[PDB]
C-alpha cells in the first residue's frame, strides 16, 4: 500500500500504443490509457516514469502532460 506522500514530478497519459522488442526491457511498454509516474525529467532528453512496477524510458510525444494551471474553479 501508499504509505501516505507522493515522490513524483508529474503525470502524463498515453494516447499512443507502442510495445518494444523481446530483447529490449528499458523499453516501457506504453497502451493507450495508461498512467506514467515521471520521477525524473532532464533537460535536455528522456523521461523516466514507472508503470507496472517497471521504470524506464519513454517520449513525451508519446504522451501528453497533464498540466493543470494556475488559476481554476
Same mark, same amino acid.
Given at each position: *500500500? &501508499?504509505? /501516505?506522500? =507522493? /515522490?513524483?514530478?508529474? !503525470?502524463? !497519459?498515453?494516447?499512443?500504443? @507502442?510495445? %518494444? ?5 528499458? =523499453?516501457?511498454?506504453?497502451?493507450? /490509457? ?5 520521477? &525524473?525529467?532532464? %533537460?535536455? *532528453? ?9 521504470? /524506464?524510458?519513454?517520449? @513525451? ?5 497533464? =498540466? &493543470?494551471?494556475? =488559476? &481554476? *474553479?
Amino acid at each position: *500500500g &501508499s504509505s /501516505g506522500s =507522493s /515522490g513524483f514530478c508529474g !503525470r502524463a !497519459r498515453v494516447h499512443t500504443d @507502442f510495445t %518494444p522488442s523481446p530483447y529490449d526491457t528499458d =523499453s516501457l511498454k506504453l497502451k493507450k /490509457g495508461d498512467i506514467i509516474d515521471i520521477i &525524473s525529467k532532464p %533537460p535536455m *532528453g528522456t523521461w523516466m516514469g514507472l508503470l507496472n512496477n517497471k521504470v /524506464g524510458t519513454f517520449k @513525451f510525444i508519446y504522451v501528453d502532460v497533464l =498540466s &493543470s494551471g494556475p =488559476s &481554476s *474553479g
